Amino acid sequence: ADRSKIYMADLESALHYILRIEVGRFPVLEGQRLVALKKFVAVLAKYFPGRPLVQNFLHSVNEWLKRQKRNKIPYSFFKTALDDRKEGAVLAKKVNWIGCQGSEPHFRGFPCSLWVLFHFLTVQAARQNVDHSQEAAKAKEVLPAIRGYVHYFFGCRDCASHFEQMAAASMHRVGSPNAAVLWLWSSHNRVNARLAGAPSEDPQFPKVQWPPRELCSACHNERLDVPVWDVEATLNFLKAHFSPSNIILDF
Ligand SMILES: Cc1cc2nc3c(=O)[nH]c(=O)nc-3n(C[C@H](O)[C@H](O)[C@H](O)COP(=O)(O)OP(=O)(O)OC[C@H]3O[C@@H](n4cnc5c(N)ncnc54)[C@H](O)[C@@H]3O)c2cc1C
């Protein structure tokens, strides 16, 4: 795969994995886990960079949730809605990792696709006009939606505990779409720092403070008495990297 390229197969297997495996770990979707589910889905429908069918599917599922008056939705009930709207023909029946494929089955995979997805949502919401309060409010729900999803659905708790630590510590300081793009970007790099050279690291895919120079030379400053990262150059790299034009459609 290409490190500068994003594969639609990764983003789609992410949606398929989230809907079938992650939400399905809970027999009854209720309370706050349900609220977070609804918020995240609404974010997907609006910002996921999906093709025609995908976006139609997301909107339909999103409309189904909104209509559910029950304050408790058994997964059984939710599974039907996915089936009725045929998430199968829309996404796929099996996960398909490309840029997120690990040197071994237990490496990378979903977690990798979920970060990519989270970053894309942030960028998408920062690459859409938000000068209108109505949508400037929808853009504001991205990071919290992402926080809610991680807490209530993300598989490895080991993983959710470390994100939430960063979240509680400084997410309350993000005051704009680009600010959110950067927060998620640097929070992921903090995680990269913690996991670097760890025994669980994918040998073939060592952690680095991303993006590396080989990927974006203009992103790093040169002087040592100034920030390590040229935030402006980096932000521009992000919007370009996490954009529809950089997505390699799975034809
Ligand atoms: C919220 C969350 C918390 C996690 N916490 C832990 C944990 O505590 N312990 C543990 O073992 N695992 C944790 N994981 C898993 C871990 O972060 C990796 O996903 C995994 O180890 C696979 O790493 P990877 O090298 O394939 O790339 P990943 O880190 O999964 O990166 C996906 C890809 O996104 C890009 N990328 C890299 N850094 C950035 C960045 N800063 N900003 C934007 N894009 C970037 C690259 O193109 C890269 O190939 C967590 C995942 C999430 C989503």
Name all domains of the chain by residue range, CATH numbers in brackets. Answer: 1-97 (1.20.120.1960), 98-251 (1.20.120.310)
> Does 188 sit in the ligand 1 pocket, CB within 6 Å?
yes
Ligand 1 atom at minimum distance from 161 CA: 8
**Ligand 1 mutation pick, 115, 154, 190, 243, max ligand atoms within 8 A of CB:** 115
* Close Cβ partners of 100 (under 8 Å, ≥ 6 residues apart): 7, 10, 108, 109, 110, 112, 113, 116
Q: Whose CA is nearest to atom 20 of ligand 1?
A: 108
The pairing of strands 247-248 and 6-7 is parallel
Place of tokens 């589910």: 37
Tell me the CA–centroid distance for residue 2 and ligand 1, in Å.
17
Place of tokens 């807490």: 151
Structure tokens at 142: 């991205």
**DSSP conformation class of 212:** P
Q: Whose CA is nearest to atom 42 of ligand 1?
A: 185
Exp. method: X-ray
Residues annotated as binding site for FAD?
Answer: 108, 115, 119, 158, 162, 185-192, 207, 210
Q: Whose CA is nearest to atom 3 of ligand 1?
A: 159
**CA 187, CA 103: separation in Å to the nearest integer?**
25
CB 165 within 8 A of CB 179: no
Resolution of this entry, Å: 2.0
Peptide bond into 211 cis (omega under 30): yes
Q: How far is CA 124 from CA 93, 121, 251, in A?
A: 26, 5, 22
CB 87 within 8 A of CB 16: yes
